[PDB]
Amino acid sequence: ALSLDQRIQTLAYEELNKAVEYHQAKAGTVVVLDARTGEILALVNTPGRNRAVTDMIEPGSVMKPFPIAKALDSGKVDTTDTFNTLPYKIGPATVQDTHVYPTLDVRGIMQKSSNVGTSKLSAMFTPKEMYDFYHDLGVGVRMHSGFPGESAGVLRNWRKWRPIEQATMSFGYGLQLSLLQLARAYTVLTHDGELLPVSFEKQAVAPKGKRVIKASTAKKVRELMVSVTEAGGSGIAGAVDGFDVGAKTGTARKLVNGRYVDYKHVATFIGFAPAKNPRVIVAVTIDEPTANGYYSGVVTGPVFKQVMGGSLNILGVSPTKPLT
Ligand SMILES: *C(=O)[C@@H](NC(=O)[C@H](NC(=O)N1CCN(CC)C(=O)C1=O)c1ccccc1)[C@@H]1N[C@@H](C(=O)O)C(C)(C)S1
């Protein structure tokens, strides 16, 4: 009566262990969810605690689809709109990207992973609006998944936010999610705008979602997220032959003494396929790779590719386009 698919569980375990060994990393996790039910199809960690559920991290760039979705859902932003994406200051803090683009449209913000552009979309809303949105995604909220030691994550009350915090939260710092919570939040994108519960028991009754965005918004965001895995995108390593994949890469500096350091990273990669009508969500995080690169695309992308490609094959889903 578990929902886990043992063939997916095996595949995820093998691919994760190979990536952690190759990159000489400290730890990692893979989660596979059913994109329309929230059932856990696989959940694996490197040896030790169930980090997928016990440990909260700053999501970094994999948070970006959500402020984007909210902006579009509000009707205040259109996908074709352009934004000033030059680095800027809020008090003494800087908001900047790893490459300077003077301007980007929404597709650009997503494809290139612009911290600046994301922060400009968030800035159109009040602290209370953005908090309510993050809360509605499950940030800071207990899933009651069935696992012991389940982290609620952290979402600071909006009454306490400084202007810099609203900005950094939009691109994934100053709030914290477990990987399972993060995979759950992506059900808003895959299940036509409603957040699903997560469970590791086979479902007998249709889960009731909570409406977070319109189905039309969800569909538009999934189309934008295909750019991440196509040429020009940060997540091209996660492309799966025969499918369109919606995804988002994240690489985050870690905190050492409450200071961000530039020699220690967490790499995350999350996506879904087939992009137009997804069957599965695959989420991958690898903590502190020390060899053979540290960016999401190079560290977690190949794991995502193998697990997603393998999962769709195991579940009997045909390629939507010819192989190559
Ligand atoms: C997404 O994850 C994004 N990553 C970064 O911008 C990342 N930035 C940070 O770690 N920080 C630390 C925290 N603060 C203060 C709150 C920041 O402003 C901040 O930006 C980073 C990581 C490594 C090197 C440079 C910057 C961009 N998306 C990833 C990705 O893999 O998609 C890029 C590497 C393309 S940048």
Domains of the chain: 1-324 (3.40.710.10)
Q: Give the resolution in Å.
A: 2.0
- What is the CA angle 228-229-234, rounded to 5? 50
Q: Two tokens at 159?
A: 């009454």
Angle between helix axes 6-22 and 301-314 (nearest 10 degrees) is: 160
**Ligand 1 centre and the CA of 171: distance in Å?**
8
Q: Helix (H, G, I), strand (E, B), or coil: what is residue 248?
A: strand
Please state, in angstroms and as integers, the Cα–Cα distance from residue 30 to each residue in 63, 122, 201, 249, following that order: 17, 29, 18, 14
Mark residue 246 as left, alpha or beta (left: phi above 0; alpha: psi -120 to 50; beta: remaining): beta
Q: Are 250 and 172 in contact (CB under 8 A)?
A: yes
Alpha-carbon dihedral 305, 310, 312, 313, rounded to 10 degrees: 140
Alpha-carbon dihedral 234, 237, 238, 244, rounded to 10 degrees: 80
**Measuring from each residue's beta carbon to the nearest atom of ligand 1, which residues come in under 6 Å?**
60-61, 98, 113, 115, 168, 173, 234, 249-253, 260, 295-297
Residues in the chain: 324
If 0-12 CB within 10 Å is exposed, 13-18 middle and 19+ buried, where does residue 171 land?
Answer: buried
Q: Are 159 and 4 in contact (CB under 8 A)?
A: no
**Ligand 1 centre and the CA of 253: distance in Å?**
7
Read off the DSSP letter of residue 41.
Answer: E
Read off the DSSP letter of residue 176.
Answer: B
Q: Is 178 labeled as catalytic in the residue annotation?
A: no
For ligand 1, atom 4: residue with the closest CA: 251
Ligand 1: which of 251, 259, 270, 287 to mutate, judged by most atoms within 8 Å of the beta carbon? 251
Question: Could you give the CA distance from residue 248 to residue 194 in angstroms, rounded to a whole number?
Answer: 19
Task: Tally DSSP H helices, then E strands, for the chain.
Answer: 12, 11
Amino acid of residue 91: G
- What is the CA angle 121-126-129, rounded to 5? 90
**Ligand 1 centre and the CA of 63: distance in Å?**
12
Residue with tokens 């469970």: 199
Question: Could you give the CA distance from residue 188 to residue 229 in angstroms, rounded to a whole number?
Answer: 20
Give the rounded distance of the alpha carbon of 277 from its chain centre: 18
